[PDB]
Structures are given as C-alpha cells and as structure tokens.
Amino acid sequence: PLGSMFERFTDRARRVVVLAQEEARMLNHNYIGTEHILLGLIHEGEGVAAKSLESLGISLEGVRSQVEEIIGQGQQAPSGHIPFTPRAKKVLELSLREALQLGHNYIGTEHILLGLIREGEGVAAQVLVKLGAELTRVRQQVIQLLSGY
Numbered sequence: 001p002l003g004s005m006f007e008r009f010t011d012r013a014r015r016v017v018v019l020a021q022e023e024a025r026m027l028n029h030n031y032i033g034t035e036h037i038l039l040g041l042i043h044e045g046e047g048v049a050a051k052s053l054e055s056l057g058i059s060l061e062g063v064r065s066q067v068e069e070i071i072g073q074g075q076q077a078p079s080g081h082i083p084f085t086p087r088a089k090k091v092l093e094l095s096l097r098e099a100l101q102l103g104h105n106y107i108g109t110e111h112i113l114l115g116l117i118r119e120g121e122g123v124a125a126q127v128l129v130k131l132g133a134e135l136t137r138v139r140q141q142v143i144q145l146l147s148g149y
Contacts, residue, residue: 020039025077028073028074028076028078031082032083032084033085041112042059048109051145063127087123091116095107095114102146
C-alpha cells in the first residue's frame with residue numbers, strides 16, 4: 001500500500017528481483033518478465049520458492065534453456081534499469097495479495113511464486129508447463145512447505 005514497490009519484500013525476495021534483472025540482462029532482454037522472476041526465484045537458492053521448484057525438478061539451466069528457445073536471445077544488452085512487463089507487475093501485485101491473505105506483513109519468495117502461479121498465463125507459466133510442472137502442483141508444493149508447523 002504505502003511506500004516503495006519493494007518496501008515489504010524480505011531480504012531474499014529483494015534478492016529474487018535483483019537476480020531477475022540480471023537474468024534479463026544476460027539474455028539481452030528489454031523487460032523483466034515473469035520468466036525472469038521465475039529464474040530469480042530459483043537462482044536465489046534458499047527460500048521456499050527455490051526449495052519448492054527444485055524439489056519438482058525445475059532447474060535454473062532448464063528454465064534458461066526454455067526461455068532461450070521460446071523467446072530467444074535479444075540482439076543488444078540493455079544498460080541500466082530494465083522495466084517490468086505489465087504481466088510481471090501484475091505478478092508482483094498478486095504477491096502482495098497472497099502475503100496479506102496468508103497473514104503476513106512481509107512478501108517472501110513463497111508469495112512471489114504463489115503470485116506467479118495465480119497470474120498463470122505468461123512466459124514463466126509456459127515454461128513450467130513445458131518442463132512438466134503443472135501450475136497446481138507447484139502451488140501444492142509451496143503450500144505444503146508453509147503448512148504443518
């Protein structure tokens with residue numbers, strides 16, 4: 001609500017966004033799309049989102065390969081800040097809604113992944129399906145990791 005786009009993000013969730021930007025830059029991409037957020041979630045390596053994805057066999061190299069196939073490497077590397085796609089912004093908005101509903105005042109890696117699945121229609125969703133990870137199964141893995149405590 002108040003403040004910066006990223007005020008509520010945990011340290012790990014902030015690192016997801018930093019990594020997403022660098023993953024877009026490495027592909028010579030002109031936006032940070034949902035698939036770069038997916039790459040950042042895995043790349044971050046420690047959070048609930050990375051754990052959920054890797055335990056389903058979704059790998060950083062597998063996602064990078066699928067993105068290069070579907071989207072293709074761009075011609076020129078962007079310099080500076082790379083803007084979000086409209087879909088990636090919607091994912092980030094949904095991540096806040098997921099965190100609020102779950103009773104938290106922070107947005108963690110789990111909430112970004114749940115927001116990504118809820119949007120369910122962009123490049124990340126296309127890649128997860130191509131790799132054999134159904135969106136509902138990814139959601140189930142996250143919820144399982146958040147439950148049972």
